[PDB]
Design a protein around this ligand. Structure first.
Ligand SMILES: [Zn+2]
Ligand SMILES: [Zn+2]
Ligand SMILES: [Zn+2]
Ligand SMILES: [Zn+2]
Ligand SMILES: [Zn+2]
Ligand SMILES: [Zn+2]
Ligand SMILES: [Zn+2]
Lengths: 93, 433, 92, 93
């Protein structure tokens, strides 16, 4: 047997505190991932690009210049990057 | 169908009375964990019945009897075999453990959503789990003509736990008197949440309808393109809509002097104490919805707060001091970066200011205990005061950060996020000692 | 360093530390009555500090980023619903 | 007399109100120094590494590592505090 001291009791107290907190965190982690994996068997992580060019689906920035939105107020296709300016002039009606 | 379910809980769940009894006990244990003062909780849910130690690892509350057993000395395991009680609840988190599987039962929605046990069959048939793609609400907002000063803010709102809970709880939808997303801001925001986290219907654009509705609302009510100003604009609209939906706004006001139960005023508001000079001669308390800080010649956010909190400059003393009388649940900070000079020119301050992942506010409250906030949102600005671009960064569960650059949503390391030139910071309360 | 003789007798008495080394006959189920009496508690947001430094009517979510937003989606209209909102939504 | 010294001391710490202070202080520090989020990462990483969400299995690779990641400063500060509390209620030879 070891000779129990204030230091050994104290390490023991800290270790209880430490292990309980680790075991709480890990439990929360393992239950979450088990849920995600059971819920979505084809679950894929979000893409990460060290080059900082690709999105969470591994795709490049789409060109907003060449996108359009159908405006319900006038029934026109409007270039997306122009929707704000268009609204100010269209909603005036 | 790779990952399986604990066959033991499944077996017991073949009998209805047994199913209801397990769920009742789980709710019960969880209820107790949420309504026990610290000492009681330690002595009664974290005290092992065998070795009598506190916190000897996780301590488990048995489903079938009153015993609590510890992990570190294997004392619940011993209980499971010698008595046949194999299900225990971790008193730190309410998770249910199986000691035959030697694993947590985490993938049965009924157990996860036990509060709904009594209604489970309706719930299961009429609602579905989130789709993989929408589960985290991630989706970009197209820049429709200098509207990143709006989209950057919206992203942070949409990933704010409090606002997200508020919208998904149907609070506003249940009391709104306009019921139109093309006229009511709150309705417009509800629709964005709907698009981002659920399904709105049955190019190249997707999930922009709510945002478009919000622009339409904006126009009906009616430049500088300051994201901070739009933060203030939108939180104001949420409040006004709350007040509009009350049956008795007038009398509630004089009821409790200028006090509000709306989402904005119960989450984002605090108060500053302005003190004159060992007692304080005079004291004015003034609410705030965010703190606007000066950054000139400073390198760190603590230094900014320190400055804001400084003493400056009679019966018994005179010295002036600004401090926090009341803190908010979500603390929002603006680092002042836009100067508007008298000659009409504008000057942008690109100084990097270090800001921490966790902010301790104790030194700024008028011994104060550690009061620790978690950084969950950054809005950053690049370029000139008027012809600039805003980008949002948000932290969601698990610690992953995401950068929202108009329609592009990308993942980013925390290390890189921390290098950003912060303009607005969103901190959520995490620990109060 | 120094070996421990024991805990101060005076302290043993104050806190009624002398116990039975055998198994406890305590029951966590016995706590329900006290629990029902007691207002919502947080694991690590001190109630008294909250009264002092926060607003009485503050909304408080503990460890908001602990796990993902827990919700389900109505199959009729597609709205994301907080668990505590599902039943009422299914009634309207 | 026996190995009930530790439980008895913990009972004093809890009843006296000092266990709360220690637990809260330790948590505050570990949270602030980045350790809580470190352990979550480490757990996620260990799940992927072992292709498992089994708690017992995962705990056994995380805990040892997690205990070791506690900064010297936090460890020796909370130890010192635990020690001072015990200095008050134990006798030594
Ligand atoms: Zn139009
Ligand atoms: Zn099992
Ligand atoms: Zn034990
Ligand atoms: Zn039992
Ligand atoms: Zn509305
Ligand atoms: Zn309000
Ligand atoms: Zn519906």
């Amino acid at each position: 047997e070891e000779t129990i001291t204030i230091d050994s009791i104290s390490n023991g107290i800290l270790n209880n505190l430490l292990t309980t907190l680790i075991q709480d965190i890990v439990a929360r982690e393992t239950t979450q991932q088990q849920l995600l994996k059971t819920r979505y068997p084809d679950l894929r992580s979000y893409y990460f690009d060290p080059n900082g060019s690709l999105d969470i689906n591994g795709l490049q920035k789409q060109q907003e210049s060449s996108q359009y939105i159908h405006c319900e107020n006038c029934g026109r296709d409007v270039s997306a990057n122009r929707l704000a300016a268009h609204l100010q002039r269209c909603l005036s009606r | 169908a790779a990952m399986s379910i604990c066959p033991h809980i499944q077996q017991v769940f073949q009998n209805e009375k047994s199913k209801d009894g397990v769920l009742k006990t789980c709710n019960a244990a969880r209820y107790i964990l949420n309504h026990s003062v610290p000492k009681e909780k330690f002595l009664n849910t974290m005290k092992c019945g065998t070795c009598h130690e506190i916190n000897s690892g996780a301590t488990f509350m048995c489903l079938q009897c009153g015993f609590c057993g510890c992990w570190n000395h294997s004392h619940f395991l011993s209980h499971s075999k010698q008595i046949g009680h194999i299900f225990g609840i971790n008193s730190n988190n309410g998770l249910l453990f199986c000691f035959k599987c030697e694993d947590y039962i985490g993938n049965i929605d009924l157990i996860n959503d036990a509060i709904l046990a009594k209604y489970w069959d309706d719930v299961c048939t009429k609602t579905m789990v989130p789709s993989m793609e929408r589960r985290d609400g991630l989706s970009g907002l197209i820049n429709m003509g200098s509207t990143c000063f709006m989209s950057s803010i919206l992203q942070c709102l949409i990933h704010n736990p409090y606002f997200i809970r508020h919208s998904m709880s149907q609070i506003h939808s249940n009391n709104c008197k306009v019921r139109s997303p093309d006229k009511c801001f709150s309705c417009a925001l509800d629709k964005i949440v709907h698009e981002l986290y659920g399904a709105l219907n049955t190019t190249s654009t997707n999930r922009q309808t709510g945002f478009i509705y919000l622009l339409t609302c904006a126009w009906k009510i009616n430049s500088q393109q300051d994201a901070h100003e739009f933060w203030q604009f939108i939180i104001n609209q949420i409040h006004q809509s709350y007040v509009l939906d009350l049956p008795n706004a007038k009398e509630v006001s004089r009821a409790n002097n200028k006090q509000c139960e709306c989402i904005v005023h119960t989450v984002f508001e605090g108060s500053l104490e302005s003190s004159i000079v060992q007692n304080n001669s005079k004291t004015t308390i003034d609410p705030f919805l965010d703190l606007s800080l000066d950054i000139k010649d400073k390198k760190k956010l603590y230094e900014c707060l320190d400055s804001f909190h400084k003493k400056e400059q009679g019966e018994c003393n005179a010295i002036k001091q600004l401090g926090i009388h009341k803190l908010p649940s979500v603390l929002v900070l603006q680092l002042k970066r836009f100067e508007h000079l008298l000659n009409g020119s504008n000057r942008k301050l690109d100084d990097f200011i270090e800001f921490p992942t966790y902010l301790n506010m104790k030194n700024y409250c008028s011994k104060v205990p550690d009061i620790i906030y978690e950084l969950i949102g950054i809005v950053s600005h690049k370029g000139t005061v008027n012809e600039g671009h805003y980008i949002a960064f948000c932290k969601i569960s698990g610690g992953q950060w995401f950068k929202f650059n108009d329609s592009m949503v990308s993942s980013i390391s925390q290390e890189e996020v921390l290098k950003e030139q912060a303009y607005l910071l969103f901190y959520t309360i995490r620990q109060v000692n | 360093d120094a070996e421990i003789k024991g805990i101060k007798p005076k302290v043993i008495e104050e806190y009624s530390l002398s116990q039975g080394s055998g198994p406890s006959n305590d029951s966590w189920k016995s706590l329900m009555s006290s629990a029902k009496d007691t207002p919502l508690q947080y694991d690590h947001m001190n109630r008294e500090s909250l009264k002092k430094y926060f607003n009485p009517n503050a909304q408080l979510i503990e460890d908001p980023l602990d796990k993902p937003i827990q919700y389900r989606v109505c199959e009729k209209c597609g709205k994301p619903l907080a668990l505590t909102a599902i039943v009422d939504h299914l009634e309207n | 007399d026996t190995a009930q010294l530790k439980s008895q001391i913990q009972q004093y710490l809890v009843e006296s109100g000092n266990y709360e202070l220690i637990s809260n202080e330790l948590k505050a520090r570990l949270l602030q120094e980045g350790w809580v989020d470190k352990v979550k990462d480490l757990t996620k990483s260990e799940m992927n590494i072992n292709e498992s969400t089994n708690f017992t299995q995962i705990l056994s690779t995380v805990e040892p590592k997690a205990l070791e990641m506690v900064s010297d400063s936090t460890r020796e500060t909370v130890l010192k505090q635990i020690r001072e509390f015990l200095e008050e209620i134990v006798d030594t030879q």
